[PDB]
Amino acid sequence: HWGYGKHNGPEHWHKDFPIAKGERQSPVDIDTHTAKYDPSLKPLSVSYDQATSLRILNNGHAFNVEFDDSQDKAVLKGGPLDGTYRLIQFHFHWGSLDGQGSEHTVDKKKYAAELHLVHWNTKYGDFGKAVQQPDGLAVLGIFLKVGSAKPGLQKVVDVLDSIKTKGKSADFTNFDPRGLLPESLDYWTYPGSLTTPPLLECVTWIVLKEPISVSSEQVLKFRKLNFNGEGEPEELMVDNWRPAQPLKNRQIKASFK
Ligand SMILES: CC(=O)Nc1nnc(S(N)(=O)=O)s1
């Protein structure tokens, strides 16, 4: 029964998930001046041309756009990664206000939201096995700032009315996640964790430097979602972000100067 409220939010999670206090937790603050340029980091290879979206689900914590990950259709390779990582889902974290919502921060700056494209290492066969491995997942994180609309986001925005409450899903086929990416694939990378329980330390984080712009109306629609199920008192789905965790014995690497 974890969540984002005063009595079950991030400061409480450690009681049920003691790895919350572990050595490689996420998110973190990205101190841009202390990140180390690593010229041997390769360009990211984002291969989403054959991506097959299936469904969108309100899980009571966020909404997930799910993909067919039973073949190498949408994969992430390159960068800091060895091998092939299949896209399973994407989701966002966002705030009640435009000045908060991201999980990662950049020189302590918070963005209005953060997109997470979640991928798992095919050598482990399935996501459940991958999350038990230190190199099991690769999450591509993209910041959202409020300004001009993101045309490639609007099909997601438009369906949210149909998944207002926890447990609701809708068909969501033929969505092209390439429409969510910024122009540049410059990134920061570090070893971390899932940012929600069970907080497993299985993630290679790849956080893009360049934010995408979304409109105020687009993020306002995110904020009309509900944490609660249908027929329960309304709890707006806002502030579903974990704050930055201690970096501990990690160095953030940059792909760019
Ligand atoms: C009633 C209640 O608080 N149940 C909880 N279950 N897990 C929680 S936690 N520590 O993961 O936030 S709180």
Ligand SMILES: CC(=O)Nc1nnc(S(N)(=O)=O)s1
């Ligand atoms: C199925 C799945 O992807 N679960 C996740 N839990 N937390 C995640 S995050 N915020 O670290 O990307 S992904």
Ligand SMILES: CC(=O)Nc1nnc(S(N)(=O)=O)s1
């Ligand atoms: C075009 C471009 O790169 N814009 C940026 N805005 N902020 C940046 S950040 N995350 O490095 O602070 S990069």
Ligand SMILES: [Zn+2]
């Ligand atoms: Zn996330």
